Design a protein around this nucleic acid. Sequence first.
RNA 1: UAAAUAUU
RNA 2: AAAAUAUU
Lengths: 378, 381, 87, 87, 98, 97, 150, 151, 176, 176
Amino acid sequence: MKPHFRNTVERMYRDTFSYNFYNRPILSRRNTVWLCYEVKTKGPSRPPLDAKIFRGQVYSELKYHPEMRFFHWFSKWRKLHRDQEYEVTWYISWSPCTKCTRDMATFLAEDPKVTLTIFVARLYYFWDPDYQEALRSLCQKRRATMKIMNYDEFQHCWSKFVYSQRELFEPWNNLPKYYILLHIMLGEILRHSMDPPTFTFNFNNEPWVRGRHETYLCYEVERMHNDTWVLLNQRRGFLCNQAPHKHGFLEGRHAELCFLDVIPFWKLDLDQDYRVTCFTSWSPCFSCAQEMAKFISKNKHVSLCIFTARIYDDQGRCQEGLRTLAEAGAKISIMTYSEFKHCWDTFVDHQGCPFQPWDGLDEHSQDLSGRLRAILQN
Amino acid sequence: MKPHFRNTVERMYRDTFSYNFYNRPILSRRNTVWLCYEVKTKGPSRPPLDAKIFRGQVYSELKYHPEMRFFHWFSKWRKLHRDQEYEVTWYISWSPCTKCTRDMATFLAEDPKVTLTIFVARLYYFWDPDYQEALRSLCQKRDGPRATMKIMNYDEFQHCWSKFVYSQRELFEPWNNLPKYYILLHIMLGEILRHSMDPPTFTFNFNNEPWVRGRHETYLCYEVERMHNDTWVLLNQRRGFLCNQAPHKHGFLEGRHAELCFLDVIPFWKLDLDQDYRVTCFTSWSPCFSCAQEMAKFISKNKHVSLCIFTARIYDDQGRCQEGLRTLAEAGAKISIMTYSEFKHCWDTFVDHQGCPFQPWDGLDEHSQDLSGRLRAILQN
Amino acid sequence: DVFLMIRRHKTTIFTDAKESSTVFELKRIVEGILKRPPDEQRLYKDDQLLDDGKTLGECGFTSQTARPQAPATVGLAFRCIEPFSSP
Amino acid sequence: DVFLMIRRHKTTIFTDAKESSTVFELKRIVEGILKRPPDEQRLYKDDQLLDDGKTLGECGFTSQTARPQAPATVGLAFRCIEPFSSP
Amino acid sequence: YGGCEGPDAMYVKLISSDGHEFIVKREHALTSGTIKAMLENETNEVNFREIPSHVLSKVCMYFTYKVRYTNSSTEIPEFPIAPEIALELLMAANFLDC
Amino acid sequence: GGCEGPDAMYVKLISSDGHEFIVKREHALTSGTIKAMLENETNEVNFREIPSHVLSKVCMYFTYKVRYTNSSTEIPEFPIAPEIALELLMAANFLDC
Amino acid sequence: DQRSKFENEEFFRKLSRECEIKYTGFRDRPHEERQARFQNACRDGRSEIAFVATGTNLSLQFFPASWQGEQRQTPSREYVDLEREAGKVYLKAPMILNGVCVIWKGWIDLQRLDGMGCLEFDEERAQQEDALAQQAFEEARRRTREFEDR
Amino acid sequence: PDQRSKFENEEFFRKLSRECEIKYTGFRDRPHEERQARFQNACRDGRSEIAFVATGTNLSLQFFPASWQGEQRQTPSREYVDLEREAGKVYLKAPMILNGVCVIWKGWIDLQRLDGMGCLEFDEERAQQEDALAQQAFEEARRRTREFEDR
Amino acid sequence: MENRWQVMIVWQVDRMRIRTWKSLVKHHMYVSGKARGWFYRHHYESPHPRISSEVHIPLGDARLVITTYWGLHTGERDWHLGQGVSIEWRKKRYSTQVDPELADQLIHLYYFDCFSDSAIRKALLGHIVSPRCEYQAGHNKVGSLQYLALAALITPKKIKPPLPSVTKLTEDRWNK
Amino acid sequence: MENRWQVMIVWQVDRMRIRTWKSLVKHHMYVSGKARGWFYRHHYESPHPRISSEVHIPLGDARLVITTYWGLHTGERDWHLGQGVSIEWRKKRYSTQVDPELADQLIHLYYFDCFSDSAIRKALLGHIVSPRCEYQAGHNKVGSLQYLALAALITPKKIKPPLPSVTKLTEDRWNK
RNA sequence: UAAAUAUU
RNA sequence: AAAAUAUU
Ligand SMILES: [Zn+2]
Ligand SMILES: [Zn+2]
Ligand SMILES: [Zn+2]
Ligand SMILES: [Zn+2]
Ligand SMILES: [Zn+2]
Ligand SMILES: [Zn+2]
């Protein structure tokens, strides 16, 4: 009375769904991998023609992994209609493995009429160089669209791929923090970059602007060695503020807060000296500045440096926060032509276009520098 | 490759505790038995001399069941001090099985220096006649083992979370229906073990003197009978009593009423829809208005149950209690008053009278007649 | 009852008999086919010479020894243990 | 190199030799013990007499046949394959 | 008491293709359809063209087994069969309809 | 090499059953008992209890160990059977193999 | 055909040959209590009484006809008699086993609480029993599964 | 003397002192010209890692930049790479301590094939320079066996 | 007299065998499609004070009902045999008790896969045989030499969990 | 100024073998009580850009350090062998590489159980031998015939999961 | 909306 | 706490 490993189901129990899809970035004992999939013609907004669930142990043989088993079934099912193009959607608890990623790349390169979207609750072995390279080859190269699961996708899975009866989805405690951490880490891995228009809009030193309701932050890190700075090519990326949302954060988090939330994951050695360079469209507000000051005081090793395109002054408390930032040791500056060009060439998919400065860039930079310089000492 | 079965963990993970010990009376997929235990000496309440967790499977071999493992270990560990009195406390996710209950009875009979207390999150196969007999022989009997069995409350769950979980800098968060499930399990276990009131409680509460003082509870004693061949046959299984749950921060915020607890336990009897049943209740205080309304609704929905309420007194407030009685009677209920015959029957059936006779109090007949007239007027007005 | 097979010179008989039946009864039974007097007809067991009077019990053979799925083997002679064929 | 066994008249000699070594070299080796001329002595394999002039490759034996745990077995003759003892 | 030479033989003669001869009661062969049809009443000897001696020995033992336990349905004993003989035994059974 | 001289290439080993083998001196040096026994004037060994098959097996062990005394790459197996394992163990204990 | 099946067959592991049976209830209880409550139950007809053959696992259980529910028409009379002999109880129970109707008869001594039982054929129930169902069962039990799937 | 005797008469590390064919493995998949250019650049700069593997085994030698190790290790003997002795060959010299005995691994790689040969030689210089107690500790660790030692 | 009864043959089994039976039947009714079409009644679905369950197996137009019982005083001194089993074959109002072996023979006649008629010819041609018998309990009588030979050459399937066998349920283990 | 290098020995292994080693080392470090005293360093506890983990196995004064590695371009065409293993013997300043077989013989000197001194006698006396060797990689060399005979007489213990071995970790698979 | 080894 | 097959 010990049935064989059941590697396929139609829906999963509520306790199972809650125990497996809990998306803490560093979670143990989730040894099984679940994969709820849907297939549908390219014609949108019609009931899917097939949708099921494949499960499998992580430490099994590669052929029993849910991804490989799904592709094995799909290869046979695809001969039915060779003239029809398909879109496939995955919701998988653990992210695929290196071998699975490479083999999915091969499988999809073989098929020119199948689009694949993947949603992951957590990233599996996100700190292994080969897994990073395998994901880079699979996804960005150009179609496999790997994303993280949000409240919407979790609710969709709960509604369609769970036996829940007359039950409403109940998010666990830290769902939004974990989601944003995973989003930041995946963006760091895949090496996402801004579109040219977005940076052009959001990084104008021009004091007079319109619609500047969102704050960006483009970061990078440098390590000490031989009295020299070495770029840590892992620690590079950017992020933007999250607007308040009923299901997400009720009060939208500030890009600076997300940056401070992600910094601890890097496991920067306590005995090593690191410089964290940041570029921002708006100067940090008072609450953000206080958080940075206390964090930098707490962290001896880290050394923060902030460059800005504009000074966000409101009620005069921001300048007060800058004083405690400076006391902590955080050097604050303004973005000039050199730094603007560096951001354009480093954090934008410019397609090799050279930076095109706008009118009055130097004058605006000088005005901002004059405004900023006096506050610290005077 | 896969390690061997682990059965002597030190503490269990928070998800494990929340999953195994969820005390819904009817839970599937919980194919594992967890047994936390503590052992201490008789004297001032002191830190336990030992405490661990045994683990097993329900479908495994009896010699591997968690309870048998504990008794095997104890039979040896006790030899160090043969003159030591040992108090053992179990917190177990499933009540011991029939064979294990019998084996525990034999074990405890053999050893006269052990006192065993058991707290169970859920009752395992509580509808099995053989298991009921085994539980009765183990616990109900006052001879030999005198092993005590109880349902786990907020206090015991919190104690386990504090001492039998890797609960790091976190506080116990009860699941949704913990109080309701506790009370259902308590009522079922009392039904099984044939619990009975002490004489003082019945003498104090069931006094029909119209003017009373200092009595903030209501007691309800229930029996059931089945229709067959134009005869009513007593379902000796369905027989018990209960008292109102007063408000408590951990338990029911607004203390539940005995009538509502009774209506909550009726559905679990799984009475046949195609048969006819008669449920007889003896209450110390007449139903309140909200209770009575619910009871009337329940009677209306369930056409196979015929209710018969008897009351030693009438609790009337605002006159709305009279309305409640009127609607209850119109629903189909048969409301009457408790006389000498009914008081004697309740004394004989629901009390630990030790064979003693019934000693009616003064003015019983006059009070019964007066309350009968009052109820007649209320139903006729 | 016990079923027995008698084999001699590429000839065989399958027949059932009782436990108390003696070797005299065995020769009498095989008389119906062999068409020869039983006094001389000689039986053999395990290359051993059985005496003219020989009962099962004193022989030691039991119903366990002789089964429908494994009948006892005994040779015959008048006045060569031929093995079966092979694949 | 391969270790060889010789089996005759309740004696055996253990020695390692090259594969290309001819039977003449084996007889030279055993001469150091038997104090007899190589010419008349004849070896045996699988109860088959070995001619005066023979080679390992010609015999077909290989280093796999003769191992430090299961050496090739050959008898001897002068001018009976005695089995090993039993528990 | 039946004599093989007479009509009521009571013991039919079977000749193995290999060359061995057995003899078995009329009903025991009746359990096999082919010999039943063949035995026609004036014949008392059946010769096999391809069945080896061991195959015929085993099928005769099977006749004994079946007649002994045709009615019995309690604690039936085991009937030996081996893979090396299984295929040819199946062929013989199909030929004889066992 | 010559067997006439006491320092012969091999050494006589008579079995308890009454069977004689001969094995190199260097091979026998691996065992403490025979090493001490071979005294330089003597070139023969008498074993009170070792059966002929046990003597052959222990000599096979000497051959195997001398062949693979130094090598440690892809070492081959040394088959052993339970029916002879106990007496081989006793022989090794006596000979310090 | 039913008579032939009852006569020339190995029957159900409970052969028509008379066999010794015993009362198993209250295994543990003292003997006096056992026999007293046996007599009480036999007189009452409100409880269940079981007779087990000593050498096998088969047992005959008598339940009150009220327990099962809707009464089943009984062309034949079953009974437990305490009147034919003072110190013994007679038992008659009709049944249908493997498609053939039979009557199980037996007796139990009150002092020993164990006695004898036999199984007899019943032609009377046979002709009255429906031909359709019995023919269907006869067809269903003769068949085999091997080599029938097309 | 014991170290030299072991080197001469031991089955050495599974890496026999005899000459062995080795090849460069990095960037297997990339085309040969790219592999050659990358190998030459890696040799010149001293910033990346370069690995040479024997054809028929899984053993290989990795030349990590000494900076990665953190605290620079004292080197009584010099480890070096020649890109000057011959135009078409790259020579290597790696002092190591294998199985308790110090040796020098030497070898050459043709850059066109990024392949070549290598060998091991006994290192006499540092044998006496290395600490004393540690060598004998390793020798006893290599001699003892658990069998029949525990009481 | 004057007090009626109903009489049944009750094989005295152990409680562990009973739940193992319950586990297997549900498994193959839900987890696997093998025992789909079988019904299983819970203890509270029948008025009988002793009935513990009822497995109903439709056989064409008739049915096979296997019942378990509880609270029988027949339990051994050690309570090795407190519970019990009974097999019934009901067709409309007609009914008849059945033996466990004949019960499995009637079960395997419909539900579980077995050597098809083509098995003989496929084995003669040396070809692979499929489908093949996987329920050895449906042929517990003395089968034709054909079937024994076939079962010998090609092994029967070993399912996990084993299919519910009535013979295995009611096998006299205590009396061996 | 010419570059500086440090030279090390690495054994090409498969990432799955590294995973299993990790699993075994963790398990016997925590789940069991056998590998207690084994130190394990995570990938973030060392500055080396390639290192993945370090397992330290103190042997009295000396220390055995087994290291695995990341992101070595030497990986095979099919990436059968991207990662790598190494073994070092650190004592004070001195350090040296070691062979997988010698490494298991070294670790099995103080860690896992083996036939005791009196184990041989019980073979003759007919008693039960205890303790028995549970780690067969610590005797990979050719030992005295007494141990071989004792092992043949009494089978070695087979633990589940198997004790982590450097040999099994660094054994050849691609071509052997 | 679990009557429970239907081991998700 | 979880760097993750530490098989709760
Ligand atoms: Zn995978
Ligand atoms: Zn802000
Ligand atoms: Zn139990
Ligand atoms: Zn109320
Ligand atoms: Zn079948
Ligand atoms: Zn060992």
